[PDB]
Design a protein around this ligand. Structure first.
Ligand SMILES: OC[C@H]1O[C@@H](O[C@@H]2[C@H](O)[C@@H](O)O[C@H](CO[C@H]3O[C@H](CO)[C@@H](O)[C@H](O)[C@@H]3O)[C@H]2O)[C@@H](O)[C@@H](O)[C@@H]1O
Ligand SMILES: OC[C@H]1O[C@H](O)[C@@H](O)[C@@H](O)[C@@H]1O
Lengths: 232, 225
């Protein structure tokens, strides 16, 4: 399909178009990328992802067209542990992408010590962070192996939902990420990326989270996505 | 997804979201629901269907909601025969539906000699004369039809639409010259189809054939109150 759109104002249990991976599953009409005990609280050493069944025709060489697309979602994070971890992330990878062996923890079930595009919302520590301020969370644009090729200071607000909007326009190869809270608190970051130089014409779009030594929930509450091939 | 929506201006060779069943394949950036030869000509004994991977939530007994969708598409039909048969038909069956056994001939690969709705364009021998566009709700094939005109090689733009607000399923098939055909049968979809369904097409030809070419297809569905 040149064009594809789908939305989940909410995440009821009887899902069908979502490829749950890892501890991923539905509870309380939402998606827990990270595992969560019986009482709802997050556990440790948990990782999970979910993709949308239908693949998105990212781009097409035969017609020199790239997909102009938008991704709107919302996630709230919760955890007793004073400093939740590690983070959630919207990614775009090849269709057959599966959780990389040992990609848990600060890798967010995405990478392992690929070919991907991602907009991760980290909250873990890095005693060497070279593209952010470690002693403070961050939103990072991950292109291929290069993690956070551009970041923006963020804030982890326990239990509070964060409405985000990932929009990529091929007419500029401009990927914008606008995340905001309930009280107008606004966090953003843009970055020129040529989706073609890093992903196959056909990909899969979805989310990933993870927790290692420490934890937090990564409740995916709503989502919407649209992509359309544009000449050029 | 409470709302699903997709569009294929055309059908290239690299389709990742179509469940090809039977002999349906892609050729000339279109879907050859029925099979053709190396010369691209229709043949005998054959049925073919396609489905859109992503299931469509047609209604929700929970929120008691019903999906308000819409499906447009175009096809043409070629055969060296003057009485080419049997036809192509848009449908909505459960996610597991797969070409029924011995469903060749006029069964369009949609009926065995289920739960499914379908807008069929029968060209074969519902006025047992002129072709007809029929609405097949579940097992009752064609509970409402309208004479139709087969025009070899001519595209037929079709707009099947369902509205939970009146449960009216409307079909509007028109040609280049403007000739328009329409039909619309009341249908409490909840009555025959599970909440989760798949959409797609089907066609076939037994002893009389033709080419069932799906050239494009747009679909959108959104649950409502
Ligand atoms: O339409 C005029 C022509 O009709 C021809 O009749 C065919 C024969 O009686 C015999 O072969 O049976 C077929 C129908 O059976 C199969 O084909 C139809 C159509 O493809 C299909 O619906 C059915 O399920 C089955 O597969 C007749 O069409 C023949 O009499 C010609 O001489 C005549 O001009
Ligand atoms: O759990 C957060 C953090 O804890 C410690 C390690 O397990 C890291 O890999 C992980 O990112």
């Amino acid at each position: 399909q040149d064009s594809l759109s789908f939305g989940f104002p909410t995440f009821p249990s009887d899902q069908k178009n979502l490829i749950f991976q890892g501890d991923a599953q539905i509870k309380n009409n939402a998606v827990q990328l990270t595992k969560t005990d019986s009482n709802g609280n997050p556990v440790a050493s948990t990782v999970g992802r979910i993709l949308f069944s239908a693949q998105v025709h990212l781009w097409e060489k035969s017609s020199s067209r790239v997909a102009n697309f938008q991704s709107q979602f919302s996630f709230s994070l919760k955890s007793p542990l004073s400093n939740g971890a590690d983070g959630i992330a919207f990614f775009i990878a090849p269709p057959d992408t599966t959780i990389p062996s040992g990609s848990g923890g600060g890798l967010l079930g995405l990478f392992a010590p690929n070919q991907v595009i991602a907009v991760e919302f980290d909250t873990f520590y890095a005693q060497d962070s070279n593209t952010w301020d470690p002693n403070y969370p961050h939103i990072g644009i991950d292109v291929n192996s290069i993690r956070s090729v551009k970041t923006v200071k963020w804030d982890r607000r326990d239990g509070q939902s964060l409405n985000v909007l990932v929009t990529f326009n091929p007419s500029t190869r401009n990927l914008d990420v606008v995340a905001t809270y309930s009280d107008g608190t606004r966090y953003e970051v843009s970055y020129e990326v040529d989706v073609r130089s890093v992903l196959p014409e056909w990909v899969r779009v979805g989310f990933s989270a993870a927790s290692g030594e420490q934890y937090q929930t990564h409740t995916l509450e709503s989502w919407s996505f649209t992509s359309t091939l544009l000449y050029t």
